[PDB]
Amino acid sequence: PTALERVQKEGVLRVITRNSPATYFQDRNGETGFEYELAKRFAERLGVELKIETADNLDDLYAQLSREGGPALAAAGLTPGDDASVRYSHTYLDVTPQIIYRNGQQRPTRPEDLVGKRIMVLKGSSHAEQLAELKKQYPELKYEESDAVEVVDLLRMVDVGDIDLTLVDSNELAMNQVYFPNVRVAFDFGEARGLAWALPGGDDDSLMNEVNAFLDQAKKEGLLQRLKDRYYGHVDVLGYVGAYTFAQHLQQRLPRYESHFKQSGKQLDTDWRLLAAIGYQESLWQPGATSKTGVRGLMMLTNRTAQAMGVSNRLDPKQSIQGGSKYFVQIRSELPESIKEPDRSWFALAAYNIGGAHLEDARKMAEKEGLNPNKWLDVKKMLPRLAQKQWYAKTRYGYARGGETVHFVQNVRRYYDILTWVTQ
Numbered sequence: 001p002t003a004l005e006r007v008q009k010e011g012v013l014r015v016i017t018r019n020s021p022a023t024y025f026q027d028r029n030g031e032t033g034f035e036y037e038l039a040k041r042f043a044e045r046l047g048v049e050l051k052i053e054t055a056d057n058l059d060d061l062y063a064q065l066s067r068e069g070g071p072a073l074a075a076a077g078l079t080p081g082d083d084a085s086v087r088y089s090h091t092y093l094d095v096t097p098q099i100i101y102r103n104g105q106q107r108p109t110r111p112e113d114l115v116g117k118r119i120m121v122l123k124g125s126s127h128a129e130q131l132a133e134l135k136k137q138y139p140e141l142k143y144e145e146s147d148a149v150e151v152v153d154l155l156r157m158v159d160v161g162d163i164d165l166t167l168v169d170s171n172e173l174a175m176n177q178v179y180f181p182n183v184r185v186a187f188d189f190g191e192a193r194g195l196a197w198a199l200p201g202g203d204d205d206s207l208m209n210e211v212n213a214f215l216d217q218a219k220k221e222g223l224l225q226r227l228k229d230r231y232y233g234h235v236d237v238l239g240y241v242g243a244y245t246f247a248q249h250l251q252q253r254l255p256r257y258e259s260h261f262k263q264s265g266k267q268l269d270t271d272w273r274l275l276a277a278i279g280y281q282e283s284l285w286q287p288g289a290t291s292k293t294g295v296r297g298l299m300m301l302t303n304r305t306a307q308a309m310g311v312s313n314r315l316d317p318k319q320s321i322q323g324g325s326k327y328f329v330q331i332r333s334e335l336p337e338s339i340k341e342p343d344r345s346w347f348a349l350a351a352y353n354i355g356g357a358h359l360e361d362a363r364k365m366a367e368k369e370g371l372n373p374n375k376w377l378d379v380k381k382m383l384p385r386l387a388q389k390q391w392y393a394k395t396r397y398g399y400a401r402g403g404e405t406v407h408f409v410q411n412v413r414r415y416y417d418i419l420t421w422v423t424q
């Protein structure tokens with residue numbers, strides 16, 4: 001039976017990956033990861049179940065792949081390795097290895113500067129191999145390979161000054177930037193290269209052909225780009241300053257209010273990280289925060305909402321978290337029965353910012369356009385229109401800043417993702 005026929009026969013596609021939020025992550029809310037979502041799509045294309053294995057490290061990852069009866073493929077942000085014990089699919093993401101340093105230290109600008117530093121990379125990585133190449137040229141270059149850490153750990157070490165430098169791909173630095181406020185790109189070390197899935201060595205090309213056809217379909221429909229934005233887009237969407245500032249706020253601000261968020265979350269069957277995400281978007285986790293628009297405190301409440309909720313002080317963190325949390329749940333509960341989770345929460349987020357009246361208008365508008373008013377992706381196309389006259393003059397409630405409401409829901413969902421992917 002071909003590699004491809006065997007997968008169909010078993011009704012399972014076995015995938016091996018790295019223990020990493022970038023690749024595969026287990027949370028109470030389900031499974032996420034750039035590679036997980038991409039592979040899950042592959043399995044479903046083939047009409048089979050996805051079964052995920054995580055390796056201990058990169059050497060063990062490649063060793064399992066060549067192992068008889070092992071996984072069909074590795075999906076793990078791999079950079080192509082002549083070792084015909086392993087083969088590689090077409091590439092699916094353009095990334096750049098980048099030398100990483102700690103802000104407030106001498107920035108190395110060229111490979112020469114890598115000499116005489118404390119450097120660590122993952123044992124078995126293409127990054128390790130790059131440094132072996134440079135060592136050939138510069139015989140006194142020192143660095144260490146480790147099989148007992150992952151990429152998140154290498155960046156922590158640079159962040160707190162445990163080591164001077166590391167070397168990682170630019171996608172994963174972007175992803176991690178929101179955890180490590182001091183980490184910065186020293187320079188791009190080596191040129192841009194594509195990530196590839198790896199398959200066992202040999203001449204059976206039945207599954208490889210399907211992987212390539214699938215990845216090429218993925219680039220046709222923007223799937224790879226959507227997945228990139230979600231996991232790797234943090235610095236691009238929130239801006240550089242937003243990225244490292246969040247890392248700082250996560251470190252400095254959140255631990256003061258984490259326990260209130262959890263307590264509000266438990267008593268309301270609502271994920272506390274979703275509540276924390278709203279607090280970040282509203283006030284950047286600052287209890288004293290006031291606007292000059294009639295909203296104040298950590299969850300940014302109006303006086304009216306504060307009183308309805310039993311809040312006697314909006315600048316009290318605990319009370320602001322409780323009232324804004326109850327309020328979000330209230331809004332979400334009042335939504336029409338027809339809106340199912342997960343959309344229901346994203347609708348509730350929009351209503352938190354714009355109110356149910358304008359949100360109704362966006363729902364009515366989607367309906368007028370032959371879209372589905374209970375689907376978030378549909379209504380989200382309608383929200384920016386509330387700010388345009390050809391549209392809002394035809395609405396009950398008129399002009400609203402719906403583009404801002406879109407921004408609100410995206411950011412919160414991103415902050416939510418970020419808080420979910422935290423490791424310790």
Ligand SMILES: CC[C@H](C)[C@H](N)C(=O)O
Pocket residue numbers: 058076077078079080122124125126127151169
């Ligand atoms: C952590 C190193 C990563 C996985 C790199 N792209 C490699 O293939 O080795």
